[PDB]
Amino acid sequence: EADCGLRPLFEKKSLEDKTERELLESYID
C-alpha cells in the first residue's frame, strides 16, 4: 500500500510529534 501515511520527518526518522501519544492512548484509555 504505497508510501502513504508514513511521514518523512517523523515515521521515516522514528520520531513522534508532541500530540500523537494522546491519539494512541485512545486505543487503551
Next chain:
Amino acid sequence: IVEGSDAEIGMSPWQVMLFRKSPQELLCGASLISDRWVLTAAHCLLYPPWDKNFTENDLLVRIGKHSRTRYERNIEKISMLEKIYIHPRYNWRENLDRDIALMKLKKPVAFSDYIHPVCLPDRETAASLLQAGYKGRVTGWGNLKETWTANVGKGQPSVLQVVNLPIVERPVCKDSTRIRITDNMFCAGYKPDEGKRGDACEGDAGGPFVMKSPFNNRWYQMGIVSWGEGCDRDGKYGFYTHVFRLKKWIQKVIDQF
C-alpha cells in the same frame, strides 16, 4: 481550529490550502491522496443558496504549507487544477449528505519532507479505527473561535493548527442536532461531561480528519471537515463526511480520470 496547538513542521504533510484567485482568499482545507489528486468537501466548491460555484481557473491549491503571514519559498508547491468532480447525490439543501469533491491537478506534485499523501482506508482498517472514544486529528488554518456570520473572517492563526477529537456514538450525534443526519457522515468531539475542548471552525472545511493505525504505523484519513452548528458548543459535535462509505465513488473517479 478551536483549542489546538501550533502544528509542527511536516506534522501533517498531506494538508492542502484551497485558495481563490479572484479575489485572493483562503476558501477551505483539503488533503493530498496521490500526486495527481486532492480530497476536499463539496460545499467548498458548490453552494447554490449563496450562489457559490467554482471552476478550475478560479481555484488554486497549495501543499506543504505551515505559516500564512509568509509565502514559503522552495517549501510550498502551488498546483493548478485540471478537473473538478463533485458527488451527484450531494445534498446541499438539508444536511450536506455526500459532502465530498475530488480535484485532479494539472501537473503532478513532487513529494518532499513537507508534501506527502495520506492513506485511504479499506474495510478492515475502517473496522479497527472508526470507534467511539477513539481519537482522530483535524487540521486547518480556520478561525480559532466561533464566528458570528457563516464564513472565514477575523480570528485567524498565523500558522497551521492541530486538534485531537474523540469519535462520538451515533445516538449522541443524532440527539445533538435537529438536522437529519445520514450514514455517509460521522460526528466527533468531546462531551459536556468530558471537560476537554476543541472543534473545527470556519475555513477548516475540506481538511482531513486522520487517525494513525496502532499496528502498521500509517496515517489514514477517516473524515473530511464537513459541518457543525457553531464552533465548540457544549452538546454540539462537528460532523465529518464518512470517507470509507464513499471510497466506492472515489475509486470510480480516480480509475476513470
